[PDB]
Amino acid sequence: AQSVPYGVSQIKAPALHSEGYTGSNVKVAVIDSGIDSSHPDLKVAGGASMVPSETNPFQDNNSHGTHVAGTVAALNNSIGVLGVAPSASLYAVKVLGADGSGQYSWIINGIEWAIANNMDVINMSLGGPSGSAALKAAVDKAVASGVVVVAAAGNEGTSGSSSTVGYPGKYPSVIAVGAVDSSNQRASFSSVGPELDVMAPGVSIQSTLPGNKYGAYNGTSMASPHVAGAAALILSKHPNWTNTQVRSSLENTTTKLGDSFYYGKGLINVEAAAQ
Ligand SMILES: [Ca+2]
Ligand SMILES: [Ca+2]
């Protein structure tokens, strides 16, 4: 039996599904630890590995990338779960090794591959406390080229009046995503700051894991994928919209929650956003 993770329902994805929009023909790049090609609930369109010690992008030795991937697009079938955009073209861009770590150079290489291959959306469920001029140039290049860039805000909670948003989420050209529970209350570990843009479900997210498994994870990393998937749905209904419009729409149709320092514009609503 297939289950619909509540997070999918929480952002109202199923409404677009009933209109017949499930993100067909939208190229989505999951820049992460890879995507387990042996998983029956996932359909991978292609990929590349930027990790010199692990050249097969289809081998997820960390489990992160496979989980994120399932949130974006777990197939609409008789098993497992269901992604936000079940018909989206998924690309495995591996930039993190087994240990969940990666060099900035690998990540930038990953972002450049995504640009060169015309991805419509890029998801980066990763963050670092420090930015680099090179990482900034790369994401700015992606937005300029027309790609929609989504990233986790970070799991550093609060720190008085200080911004705890990690990079690349901190960059203005990137859509930084924080996490809320099922009640719409901000997750205690969710990062905060002027750079936080929107909220999405990040608590106890059921998705796919390597080796034909399923399990729950908590984190802003789990939140990001919900937004990337929303973007795919939007693009499936309005293939013509620029990244500018997709972003504006997602931020202008949110369900306002509390102070923007802690919640950005609030929880996304893809039914509203998709027009
Ligand atoms: Ca399924
Ligand atoms: Ca941002």
Q: Ligand 2 center to residue 62 CA distance, Å?
A: 26
Residue 205 is labelled as binding a ligand: no
Residue 79 is labelled as binding a ligand: yes
- Cβ atoms 247, 261 nearer than 8 A: no
How far is CA 223 from its chain centroid? Answer: 7
One-letter identity of residue 45? A
Q: Using CA atoms, how far apart are residues 34 and 39, in angstroms rounded to an integer?
A: 12
- The dihedral region occupied by 118, where left means phi > 0, alpha psi between -120 and 50, and beta the remainder, is left
Q: Ligand 1 center to residue 197 CA distance, Å?
A: 30
Q: What is the resolution of this structure in A?
A: 1.9
Q: Ligand 2 center to residue 174 CA distance, Å?
A: 4
Q: Using CA atoms, how far apart are residues 69 and 55, in angstroms rounded to an integer?
A: 19
- The two three-digit tokens of residue 215, written as one number: 């399990």
Determine whether 134 is exposed, middle or buried from the number of CB atoms within 10 Å of its CB (0-12, 13-18, 19+).
Answer: exposed
- Cβ atoms 267, 184 nearer than 8 A: yes
Q: Using CA atoms, how far apart are residues 168 and 119, in angstroms rounded to an integer?
A: 18
Domain total for the chain?
1
One-letter identity of residue 135? L
Expressed as residue numbers, the domain containing 69 is 1-275
Q: Using CA atoms, how far apart are residues 87 and 21, in angstroms rounded to an integer?
A: 9
Q: What is the separation, in whole angstroms, between the first and last Cα of the chain?
A: 32
Solved how?
X-ray
Determine whether 151 is exposed, middle or buried from the number of CB atoms within 10 Å of its CB (0-12, 13-18, 19+).
Answer: buried
One-letter identity of residue 197? D
Q: Describe the chain by its helix, strand, coil percentages, rounded to 5.
A: 30, 20, 50
Q: Using CA atoms, how far apart are residues 116 and 44, in angstroms rounded to an integer?
A: 18
- The two three-digit tokens of residue 24, written as one number: 């067909």
Nearest Cα neighbor of 13 from 236, 205, 226, 244 is 226
Residues classed as catalytic: 32, 64, 221
Residues contacting residue 215 through CB under 8 Å, at least 6 positions apart: 67, 206, 207, 209
One-letter identity of residue 185? Q
- What are the strands of the beta sheet with 27-32, ordered from one edge? 44-49, 89-94, 27-32, 121-124, 148-152, 175-180, 198-201
CA angle, 44 then 145 then 141, to 5° = 100
CATH number at residue 5: 3.40.50.200
- What is residue 219's three-state secondary structure? coil
Q: Half-sphere exposure (CA, 13 Å, Cβ side) for 119?
A: 31
Q: Half-sphere exposure (CA, 13 Å, Cβ side) for 228?
A: 37
- Cβ atoms 225, 233 nearer than 8 A: no
